[PDB]
Amino acid sequence: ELIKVPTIPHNLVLIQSDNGKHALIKEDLGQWPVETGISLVNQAGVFAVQLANKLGIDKPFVLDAGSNYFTDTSFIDTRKYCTDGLSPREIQKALNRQRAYYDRPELTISENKTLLSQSIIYPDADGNDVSIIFSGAMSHAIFTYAQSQWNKNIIKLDDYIREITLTVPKQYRPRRFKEIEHTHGYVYRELNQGSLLPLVDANLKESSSYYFKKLMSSISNVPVDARTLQSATAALAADTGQAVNRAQHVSMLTNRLTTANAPTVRAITVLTCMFKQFRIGMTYALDPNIMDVAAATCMLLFRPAQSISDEQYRYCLQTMAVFLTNTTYDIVNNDTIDVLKMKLRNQGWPFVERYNAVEIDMSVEPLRSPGQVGRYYNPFNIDPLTKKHVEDRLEEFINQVQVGRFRNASGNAVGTTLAAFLRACRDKTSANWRGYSVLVSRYRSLIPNELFESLRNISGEYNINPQDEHSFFFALAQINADDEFIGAIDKESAEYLDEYATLARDISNSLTLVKAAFGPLERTSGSIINHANNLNKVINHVFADKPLISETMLKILTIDGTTGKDGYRNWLDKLVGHNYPVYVEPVVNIMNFISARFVADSSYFGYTNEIMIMPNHINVPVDDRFGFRDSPFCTSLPRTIMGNDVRRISYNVFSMMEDIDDVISEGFILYDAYFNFSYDIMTTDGVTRLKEDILIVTDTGNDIKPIHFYIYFENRNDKKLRYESKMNVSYRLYIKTPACLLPLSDYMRAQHDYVSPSSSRVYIKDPAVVYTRS
Amino acid sequence: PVDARTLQSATAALAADTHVSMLTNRLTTANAPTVRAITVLT
């Protein structure tokens, strides 16, 4: 959601002495401690975020400052006087006090509204409003840049509809938008798509297990019709001539028709048609019987070929050859597929081939996949064009099996039972395939193309017992889509999009952290130990307070029972050294700009590169613009004093010394450190002096005490103060003049402009273009 | 120190992944420190 900022955040504060002889404007912008020995860019990152909070920049926003204005009472003056920034009245009072001290006349009537009308609101050509006010240099730069970065995502509503017009299905009622929203509508949206590949590639077993289980959970809850299989059993019984007082093979098939595990097999069937390669397998009994041959034939006929592996194919052929060709398992252990194919065919069994599954293209573009076409396998290897099984020769193959003599020379007991069984199985599939085809289409729409191409069956938890194969196809049920289930799918499609979205952000955050936190690993004990300790510190920080990663990924990473903290640490290991492309977001750009300005302009935030310590009896050039008494600031650090280059000493060497008494008498410049400092400008006239001593000398080293300046204004004819400064104070400290200060005479430089967009724009919170049917 | 919860969690996870009572019951963590001593030495 966008935020309207009502007031421009100026930071200027004006300080003036009691006499009014001097005045200056300052940009506070806070004061921040900076350390040494640690890289400054890393320290600038945390301060940059805190600065954005101070300016109200961090969250997406648009400026609303058009309404803040007033009009002067004069007839001619139709200008829109602004009410933001440093008020021109405050500047007018400061100048009038300044003119009083010099005994000059006060500002003229004509000069008053020249000054008072500098802050204006004027319209722009594009309908926007431009606000000109007195603001700080740093505040203007950061706020203007933040507005530019956020405005990229703010796009017209009609543009958004064009980008999502491909993914909208044809079964949802179109949304009607008000005419105002069409002409003057804008939407804040991030149109980047984050790939889920880093999570899936590194963690294939965990990601596949999480998605298959949730998908299986929904499919198992689908309604189905309830039709008794007594009619099918009677047809099977009559064809086989089943008797109560005999032992036939039809009894063994009939005995174990269990439909208890039907919903799980139904879910497995949809999963095979959903994904490119969802391999399933079954383990047959030690001594195969009429069921295993019936179950094995059912898999080969009515399952996608891509879902059957080469090893599983040979295993099914071996089981059929054992029962029909009547040979031991050890005999056909080394037999190839072709050898097993030939032995079965000579016996009279032709169902020795796997059949590919015809692919049906999706009607609309899949989610999280731009410019791509979806596809899924049609269930039961049925050609949509011909509404038949792929093998057009199935009917004669069934007859061939029935006349074939397997497991016995006299009688067709084995052949008739299997052929009569496959008659019903083919009839059931040829009637109920349309419902399963729609069900696969609904669930395939949830998964993206990357998950379609990557997810693989690894855990092997989705295995089907031979009893379930022959009972599922014999007792196949029509899929009935109740309104409750239709509504339930609409609910599931909601969080699937939301959970995909939150995973993309979590990966992008994780990839960015890895690049900066860690580096390459060598083959030494030192490098290994450094990685072990550093990574533990990172993993402890991310999980402290609010975790950086949402609970959505934690569920994926903990699917094996591993603790979430350990799961993320192991994933961060594989992510080091990645070449995965990450797109710089608007927020990342904003912090980098502040980080650059923090390093470039160190005076705004309260630290300096170098300081100077010189004896009082040496006169150095100082900044006399502000009129401070013994001004502690310099325009630049003097290169040469008294014709000799000023000595430069680094901080570490300075702390290390014992002749510190010999070098202070000549003066020096301390560099190679970040000197935090502070000052308090006072309106009265007094001695400018440091708050504590300059340096502390111990038996270990020499350190510089904290720098706090008590700056006072200067009056030339104050003999008491002149003697005090020259005599009492013996040593002085000098730093570069802070850039935040600005003399009152140069107040025109504080003028800055801001752009607040048109007030005719309306913002659409929910840009969805379709309505649920019911 | 050796924690028996890690063994139980690993057995539970692998039991659901694939019966597994052929080796799952035979797993005992009694001699863990000695084997760790040999691993470091090797």
Tab-separated table of N, CA and C in Angstrom, chain A residues 619-758:
chain	number	residue	atom	x	y	z
A	619	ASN	N	49.463	31.045	14.841
A	619	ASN	CA	48.227	31.497	14.222
A	619	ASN	C	47.993	30.740	12.923
A	620	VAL	N	46.828	30.108	12.810
A	620	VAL	CA	46.485	29.337	11.618
A	620	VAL	C	45.303	30.003	10.921
A	621	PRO	N	45.175	29.872	9.602
A	621	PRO	CA	43.986	30.402	8.923
A	621	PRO	C	42.741	29.636	9.344
A	622	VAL	N	41.683	30.378	9.669
A	622	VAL	CA	40.437	29.802	10.150
A	622	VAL	C	39.283	30.389	9.351
A	623	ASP	N	38.128	29.736	9.459
A	623	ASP	CA	36.917	30.206	8.798
A	623	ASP	C	36.299	31.318	9.636
A	624	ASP	N	36.387	32.551	9.145
A	624	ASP	CA	35.851	33.712	9.838
A	624	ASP	C	34.465	34.096	9.343
A	625	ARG	N	33.817	33.226	8.567
A	625	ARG	CA	32.502	33.548	8.025
A	625	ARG	C	31.458	33.678	9.126
A	626	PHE	N	31.466	32.760	10.090
A	626	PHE	CA	30.437	32.715	11.119
A	626	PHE	C	30.715	33.635	12.299
A	627	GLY	N	31.927	34.166	12.421
A	627	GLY	CA	32.229	35.082	13.504
A	627	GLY	C	32.410	34.452	14.863
A	628	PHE	N	32.718	33.161	14.927
A	628	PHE	CA	32.990	32.518	16.202
A	628	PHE	C	34.312	33.013	16.781
A	629	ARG	N	34.387	33.039	18.109
A	629	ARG	CA	35.627	33.388	18.786
A	629	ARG	C	36.574	32.197	18.758
A	630	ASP	N	37.776	32.410	18.228
A	630	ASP	CA	38.762	31.346	18.041
A	630	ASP	C	38.122	30.136	17.365
A	631	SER	N	37.667	30.355	16.139
A	631	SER	CA	36.877	29.365	15.426
A	631	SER	C	37.648	28.058	15.305
A	632	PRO	N	37.092	26.935	15.759
A	632	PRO	CA	37.808	25.659	15.676
A	632	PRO	C	37.764	25.010	14.305
A	633	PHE	N	37.166	25.664	13.315
A	633	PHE	CA	36.993	25.100	11.989
A	633	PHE	C	37.948	25.755	11.001
A	634	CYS	N	38.268	25.017	9.943
A	634	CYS	CA	39.069	25.525	8.843
A	634	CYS	C	38.407	25.136	7.531
A	635	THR	N	38.546	26.005	6.528
A	635	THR	CA	38.003	25.693	5.212
A	635	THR	C	38.650	24.437	4.648
A	636	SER	N	39.965	24.323	4.791
A	636	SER	CA	40.678	23.088	4.524
A	636	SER	C	41.855	23.023	5.481
A	637	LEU	N	42.311	21.815	5.763
A	637	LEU	CA	43.424	21.645	6.680
A	637	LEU	C	44.671	22.283	6.081
A	638	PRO	N	45.329	23.203	6.786
A	638	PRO	CA	46.464	23.919	6.190
A	638	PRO	C	47.567	22.966	5.761
A	639	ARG	N	47.968	23.080	4.495
A	639	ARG	CA	49.070	22.271	3.992
A	639	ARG	C	50.404	22.763	4.533
A	640	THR	N	50.621	24.075	4.517
A	640	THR	CA	51.873	24.671	4.965
A	640	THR	C	51.590	25.710	6.037
A	641	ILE	N	52.328	25.630	7.140
A	641	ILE	CA	52.272	26.617	8.210
A	641	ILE	C	53.686	27.120	8.453
A	642	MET	N	53.859	28.443	8.428
A	642	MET	CA	55.163	29.080	8.610
A	642	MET	C	56.183	28.597	7.584
A	643	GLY	N	55.726	28.298	6.372
A	643	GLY	CA	56.610	27.914	5.295
A	643	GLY	C	57.058	26.470	5.295
A	644	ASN	N	56.601	25.659	6.245
A	644	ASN	CA	56.978	24.256	6.327
A	644	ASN	C	55.733	23.385	6.286
A	645	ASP	N	55.835	22.258	5.587
A	645	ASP	CA	54.709	21.341	5.467
A	645	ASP	C	54.298	20.826	6.839
A	646	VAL	N	52.992	20.842	7.105
A	646	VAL	CA	52.487	20.380	8.391
A	646	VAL	C	52.618	18.867	8.469
A	647	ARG	N	53.184	18.385	9.570
A	647	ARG	CA	53.456	16.965	9.728
A	647	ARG	C	52.162	16.165	9.806
A	648	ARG	N	52.164	14.993	9.179
A	648	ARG	CA	51.049	14.060	9.234
A	648	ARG	C	51.492	12.795	9.956
A	649	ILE	N	50.719	12.387	10.959
A	649	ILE	CA	50.992	11.185	11.733
A	649	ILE	C	49.719	10.358	11.805
A	650	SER	N	49.830	9.073	11.488
A	650	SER	CA	48.690	8.180	11.595
A	650	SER	C	48.372	7.906	13.059
A	651	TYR	N	47.164	7.398	13.299
A	651	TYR	CA	46.705	7.231	14.671
A	651	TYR	C	47.449	6.108	15.384
A	652	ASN	N	47.663	4.982	14.704
A	652	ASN	CA	48.322	3.846	15.342
A	652	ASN	C	49.746	4.191	15.749
A	653	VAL	N	50.478	4.883	14.874
A	653	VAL	CA	51.834	5.301	15.213
A	653	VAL	C	51.809	6.305	16.358
A	654	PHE	N	50.821	7.200	16.356
A	654	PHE	CA	50.725	8.211	17.403
A	654	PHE	C	50.475	7.581	18.765
A	655	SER	N	49.597	6.581	18.823
A	655	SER	CA	49.322	5.915	20.089
A	655	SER	C	50.536	5.136	20.571
A	656	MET	N	51.421	4.766	19.648
A	656	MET	CA	52.526	3.853	19.908
A	656	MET	C	53.756	4.567	20.459
A	657	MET	N	53.712	5.894	20.578
A	657	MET	CA	54.913	6.704	20.756
A	657	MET	C	55.179	7.029	22.222
A	658	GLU	N	56.443	7.319	22.535
A	658	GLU	CA	56.865	7.807	23.842
A	658	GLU	C	57.361	9.243	23.805
A	659	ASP	N	57.715	9.753	22.631
A	659	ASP	CA	58.186	11.122	22.467
A	659	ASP	C	57.026	12.049	22.126
A	660	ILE	N	55.841	11.731	22.653
A	660	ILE	CA	54.656	12.535	22.378
A	660	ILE	C	54.820	13.949	22.912
A	661	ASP	N	55.662	14.133	23.931
A	661	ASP	CA	55.906	15.475	24.444
A	661	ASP	C	56.736	16.304	23.474
A	662	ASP	N	57.593	15.655	22.683
A	662	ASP	CA	58.446	16.390	21.758
A	662	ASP	C	57.689	16.849	20.519
A	663	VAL	N	56.684	16.089	20.081
A	663	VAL	CA	56.001	16.408	18.831
A	663	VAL	C	54.848	17.392	19.001
A	664	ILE	N	54.251	17.480	20.192
A	664	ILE	CA	53.128	18.392	20.374
A	664	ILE	C	53.591	19.838	20.297
A	665	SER	N	54.830	20.114	20.709
A	665	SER	CA	55.337	21.481	20.682
A	665	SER	C	55.416	22.026	19.261
A	666	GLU	N	55.514	21.148	18.264
A	666	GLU	CA	55.553	21.590	16.877
A	666	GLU	C	54.200	21.483	16.188
A	667	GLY	N	53.282	20.687	16.725
A	667	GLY	CA	51.986	20.502	16.102
A	667	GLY	C	51.990	19.399	15.067
A	668	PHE	N	50.838	18.776	14.840
A	668	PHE	CA	50.753	17.666	13.902
A	668	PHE	C	49.304	17.471	13.487
A	669	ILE	N	49.117	16.635	12.471
A	669	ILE	CA	47.803	16.265	11.961
A	669	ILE	C	47.646	14.763	12.137
A	670	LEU	N	46.554	14.351	12.773
A	670	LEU	CA	46.262	12.938	12.962
A	670	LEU	C	45.288	12.474	11.888
A	671	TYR	N	45.655	11.414	11.173
A	671	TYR	CA	44.826	10.890	10.097
A	671	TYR	C	44.766	9.373	10.237
A	672	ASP	N	44.193	8.716	9.229
A	672	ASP	CA	44.041	7.259	9.204
A	672	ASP	C	43.157	6.778	10.353
A	673	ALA	N	42.127	7.557	10.664
A	673	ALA	CA	41.148	7.185	11.674
A	673	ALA	C	39.894	8.014	11.449
A	674	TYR	N	38.803	7.581	12.070
A	674	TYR	CA	37.515	8.259	11.977
A	674	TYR	C	37.219	8.903	13.324
A	675	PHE	N	37.343	10.225	13.387
A	675	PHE	CA	37.260	10.971	14.640
A	675	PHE	C	35.833	11.474	14.823
A	676	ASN	N	35.070	10.786	15.670
A	676	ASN	CA	33.751	11.273	16.042
A	676	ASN	C	33.879	12.557	16.849
A	677	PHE	N	32.975	13.499	16.597
A	677	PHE	CA	33.029	14.795	17.252
A	677	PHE	C	31.629	15.374	17.366
A	678	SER	N	31.513	16.401	18.206
A	678	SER	CA	30.251	17.090	18.421
A	678	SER	C	30.545	18.533	18.796
A	679	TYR	N	29.536	19.385	18.640
A	679	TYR	CA	29.672	20.786	19.004
A	679	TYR	C	28.318	21.334	19.418
A	680	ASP	N	28.355	22.399	20.219
A	680	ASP	CA	27.149	23.069	20.701
A	680	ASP	C	27.364	24.570	20.575
A	681	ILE	N	26.741	25.182	19.573
A	681	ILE	CA	26.880	26.611	19.329
A	681	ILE	C	26.003	27.369	20.316
A	682	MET	N	26.597	28.329	21.015
A	682	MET	CA	25.910	29.109	22.032
A	682	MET	C	25.738	30.545	21.562
A	683	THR	N	24.614	31.152	21.947
A	683	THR	CA	24.279	32.487	21.470
A	683	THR	C	25.088	33.576	22.162
A	684	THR	N	25.543	33.337	23.387
A	684	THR	CA	26.259	34.353	24.141
A	684	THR	C	27.704	34.472	23.658
A	685	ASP	N	28.431	35.401	24.273
A	685	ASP	CA	29.848	35.595	23.998
A	685	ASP	C	30.668	34.948	25.103
A	686	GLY	N	31.594	34.077	24.718
A	686	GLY	CA	32.390	33.354	25.689
A	686	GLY	C	33.618	32.763	25.035
A	687	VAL	N	34.399	32.059	25.843
A	687	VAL	CA	35.610	31.410	25.358
A	687	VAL	C	35.236	30.100	24.683
A	688	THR	N	35.672	29.927	23.438
A	688	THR	CA	35.494	28.658	22.744
A	688	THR	C	36.560	27.682	23.220
A	689	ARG	N	36.131	26.533	23.732
A	689	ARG	CA	37.063	25.574	24.300
A	689	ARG	C	36.482	24.172	24.202
A	690	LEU	N	37.371	23.182	24.200
A	690	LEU	CA	36.946	21.794	24.224
A	690	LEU	C	36.388	21.432	25.596
A	691	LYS	N	35.538	20.406	25.618
A	691	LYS	CA	34.904	19.997	26.865
A	691	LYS	C	35.863	19.247	27.787
A	692	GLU	N	36.643	18.306	27.260
A	692	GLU	CA	37.633	17.597	28.066
A	692	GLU	C	39.035	17.845	27.511
A	693	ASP	N	40.009	17.146	28.089
A	693	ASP	CA	41.386	17.230	27.636
A	693	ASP	C	41.526	16.622	26.244
A	694	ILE	N	42.574	17.044	25.540
A	694	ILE	CA	42.760	16.602	24.162
A	694	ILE	C	43.175	15.138	24.114
A	695	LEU	N	44.150	14.751	24.934
A	695	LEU	CA	44.698	13.407	24.866
A	695	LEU	C	44.945	12.860	26.264
A	696	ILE	N	44.904	11.535	26.366
A	696	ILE	CA	45.179	10.807	27.597
A	696	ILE	C	46.371	9.897	27.345
A	697	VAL	N	47.352	9.938	28.243
A	697	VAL	CA	48.590	9.179	28.096
A	697	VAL	C	48.635	8.116	29.183
A	698	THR	N	48.675	6.856	28.769
A	698	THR	CA	48.792	5.719	29.668
A	698	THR	C	50.105	5.000	29.400
A	699	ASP	N	50.383	3.985	30.218
A	699	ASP	CA	51.581	3.187	29.997
A	699	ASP	C	51.440	2.222	28.828
A	700	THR	N	50.244	2.098	28.252
A	700	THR	CA	50.052	1.295	27.048
A	700	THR	C	50.127	2.154	25.787
A	701	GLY	N	49.267	3.164	25.686
A	701	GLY	CA	49.258	4.003	24.503
A	701	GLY	C	48.563	5.321	24.755
A	702	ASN	N	48.608	6.175	23.737
A	702	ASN	CA	47.999	7.496	23.783
A	702	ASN	C	46.707	7.486	22.981
A	703	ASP	N	45.639	8.011	23.571
A	703	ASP	CA	44.334	8.061	22.929
A	703	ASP	C	43.807	9.487	22.952
A	704	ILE	N	42.943	9.792	21.989
A	704	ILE	CA	42.290	11.093	21.895
A	704	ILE	C	40.949	11.005	22.609
A	705	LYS	N	40.729	11.906	23.562
A	705	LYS	CA	39.489	11.938	24.314
A	705	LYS	C	38.353	12.465	23.438
A	706	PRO	N	37.100	12.207	23.821
A	706	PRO	CA	35.971	12.657	22.998
A	706	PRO	C	35.989	14.163	22.780
A	707	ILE	N	35.625	14.572	21.570
A	707	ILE	CA	35.709	15.965	21.146
A	707	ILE	C	34.313	16.567	21.219
A	708	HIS	N	34.138	17.545	22.104
A	708	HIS	CA	32.900	18.305	22.207
A	708	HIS	C	33.259	19.779	22.288
A	709	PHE	N	32.839	20.545	21.288
A	709	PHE	CA	33.215	21.944	21.152
A	709	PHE	C	32.143	22.837	21.760
A	710	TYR	N	32.564	23.776	22.603
A	710	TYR	CA	31.684	24.817	23.130
A	710	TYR	C	31.987	26.093	22.354
A	711	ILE	N	31.360	26.238	21.194
A	711	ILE	CA	31.624	27.364	20.307
A	711	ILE	C	30.782	28.553	20.742
A	712	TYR	N	31.425	29.709	20.881
A	712	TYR	CA	30.765	30.950	21.249
A	712	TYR	C	31.028	32.007	20.185
A	713	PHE	N	30.134	32.986	20.106
A	713	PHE	CA	30.303	34.092	19.180
A	713	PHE	C	31.326	35.087	19.716
A	714	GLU	N	31.877	35.890	18.810
A	714	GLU	CA	33.025	36.740	19.101
A	714	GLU	C	32.625	38.207	19.103
A	715	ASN	N	33.042	38.923	20.145
A	715	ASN	CA	32.979	40.376	20.196
A	715	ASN	C	34.399	40.904	20.322
A	716	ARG	N	34.786	41.794	19.404
A	716	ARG	CA	36.185	42.197	19.299
A	716	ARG	C	36.671	42.895	20.561
A	717	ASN	N	35.872	43.808	21.104
A	717	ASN	CA	36.299	44.629	22.234
A	717	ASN	C	35.804	44.015	23.543
A	718	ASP	N	36.397	42.868	23.875
A	718	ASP	CA	36.166	42.180	25.146
A	718	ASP	C	37.542	41.798	25.678
A	719	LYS	N	38.139	42.694	26.468
A	719	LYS	CA	39.510	42.485	26.916
A	719	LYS	C	39.618	41.274	27.831
A	720	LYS	N	38.599	41.037	28.659
A	720	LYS	CA	38.631	39.888	29.557
A	720	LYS	C	38.682	38.587	28.775
A	721	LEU	N	37.859	38.476	27.732
A	721	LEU	CA	37.820	37.246	26.954
A	721	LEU	C	39.076	37.086	26.106
A	722	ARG	N	39.628	38.195	25.611
A	722	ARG	CA	40.834	38.117	24.795
A	722	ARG	C	42.011	37.588	25.603
A	723	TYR	N	42.171	38.075	26.835
A	723	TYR	CA	43.239	37.569	27.691
A	723	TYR	C	43.008	36.109	28.048
A	724	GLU	N	41.757	35.739	28.330
A	724	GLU	CA	41.461	34.363	28.707
A	724	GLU	C	41.796	33.396	27.580
A	725	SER	N	41.419	33.737	26.348
A	725	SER	CA	41.690	32.849	25.224
A	725	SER	C	43.184	32.708	24.971
A	726	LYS	N	43.924	33.815	25.024
A	726	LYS	CA	45.342	33.783	24.684
A	726	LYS	C	46.194	33.164	25.784
A	727	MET	N	45.793	33.307	27.045
A	727	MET	CA	46.607	32.858	28.168
A	727	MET	C	46.150	31.521	28.742
A	728	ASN	N	44.872	31.406	29.110
A	728	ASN	CA	44.403	30.202	29.791
A	728	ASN	C	44.480	28.973	28.893
A	729	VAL	N	44.036	29.091	27.648
A	729	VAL	CA	44.059	27.976	26.707
A	729	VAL	C	45.426	27.923	26.044
A	730	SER	N	46.085	26.772	26.139
A	730	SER	CA	47.433	26.600	25.615
A	730	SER	C	47.502	25.752	24.357
A	731	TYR	N	46.529	24.877	24.128
A	731	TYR	CA	46.493	24.044	22.937
A	731	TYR	C	45.089	24.047	22.354
A	732	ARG	N	45.010	23.920	21.031
A	732	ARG	CA	43.748	24.007	20.315
A	732	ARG	C	43.638	22.881	19.297
A	733	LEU	N	42.400	22.524	18.974
A	733	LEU	CA	42.094	21.443	18.050
A	733	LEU	C	41.319	21.992	16.860
A	734	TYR	N	41.685	21.543	15.661
A	734	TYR	CA	41.117	22.061	14.426
A	734	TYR	C	40.567	20.925	13.578
A	735	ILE	N	39.384	21.144	13.003
A	735	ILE	CA	38.754	20.206	12.086
A	735	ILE	C	38.217	20.988	10.897
A	736	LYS	N	37.896	20.261	9.829
A	736	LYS	CA	37.277	20.882	8.668
A	736	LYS	C	35.897	21.413	9.026
A	737	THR	N	35.534	22.541	8.434
A	737	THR	CA	34.248	23.153	8.742
A	737	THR	C	33.116	22.246	8.274
A	738	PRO	N	32.150	21.932	9.134
A	738	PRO	CA	31.041	21.074	8.707
A	738	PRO	C	30.260	21.711	7.569
A	739	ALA	N	29.811	20.870	6.639
A	739	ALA	CA	29.055	21.353	5.494
A	739	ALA	C	27.625	21.726	5.850
A	740	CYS	N	27.122	21.268	6.998
A	740	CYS	CA	25.747	21.575	7.374
A	740	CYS	C	25.558	23.057	7.667
A	741	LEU	N	26.598	23.728	8.154
A	741	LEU	CA	26.496	25.146	8.458
A	741	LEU	C	26.370	25.971	7.182
A	742	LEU	N	25.689	27.109	7.301
A	742	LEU	CA	25.432	27.997	6.175
A	742	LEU	C	25.172	29.406	6.697
A	743	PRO	N	25.961	30.398	6.287
A	743	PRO	CA	25.729	31.765	6.766
A	743	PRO	C	24.373	32.296	6.326
A	744	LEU	N	23.824	33.199	7.140
A	744	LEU	CA	22.514	33.766	6.838
A	744	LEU	C	22.540	34.545	5.530
A	745	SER	N	23.661	35.204	5.232
A	745	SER	CA	23.767	35.972	3.997
A	745	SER	C	23.618	35.099	2.759
A	746	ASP	N	23.944	33.811	2.855
A	746	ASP	CA	23.826	32.877	1.745
A	746	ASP	C	22.583	32.003	1.851
A	747	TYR	N	21.479	32.549	2.363
A	747	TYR	CA	20.286	31.738	2.585
A	747	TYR	C	19.639	31.307	1.280
A	748	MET	N	19.911	32.019	0.186
A	748	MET	CA	19.321	31.662	-1.097
A	748	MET	C	19.774	30.293	-1.579
A	749	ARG	N	20.914	29.804	-1.091
A	749	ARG	CA	21.403	28.496	-1.499
A	749	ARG	C	20.589	27.366	-0.887
A	750	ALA	N	19.885	27.626	0.212
A	750	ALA	CA	19.021	26.626	0.818
A	750	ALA	C	17.735	26.401	0.034
A	751	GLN	N	17.466	27.214	-0.982
A	751	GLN	CA	16.267	27.038	-1.790
A	751	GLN	C	16.332	25.732	-2.571
A	752	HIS	N	15.231	24.986	-2.548
A	752	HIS	CA	15.157	23.695	-3.212
A	752	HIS	C	13.724	23.451	-3.651
A	753	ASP	N	13.560	22.554	-4.618
A	753	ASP	CA	12.259	22.264	-5.198
A	753	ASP	C	11.881	20.805	-4.977
A	754	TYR	N	10.581	20.560	-4.858
A	754	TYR	CA	10.022	19.225	-4.722
A	754	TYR	C	8.815	19.113	-5.639
A	755	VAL	N	8.569	17.910	-6.143
A	755	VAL	CA	7.472	17.661	-7.073
A	755	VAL	C	6.480	16.723	-6.408
A	756	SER	N	5.250	17.196	-6.236
A	756	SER	CA	4.153	16.388	-5.739
A	756	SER	C	3.208	16.074	-6.883
A	757	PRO	N	2.946	14.800	-7.166
A	757	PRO	CA	2.177	14.447	-8.368
A	757	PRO	C	0.753	14.973	-8.367
A	758	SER	N	0.045	14.736	-9.470
A	758	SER	CA	-1.283	15.302	-9.652
A	758	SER	C	-2.245	14.788	-8.593
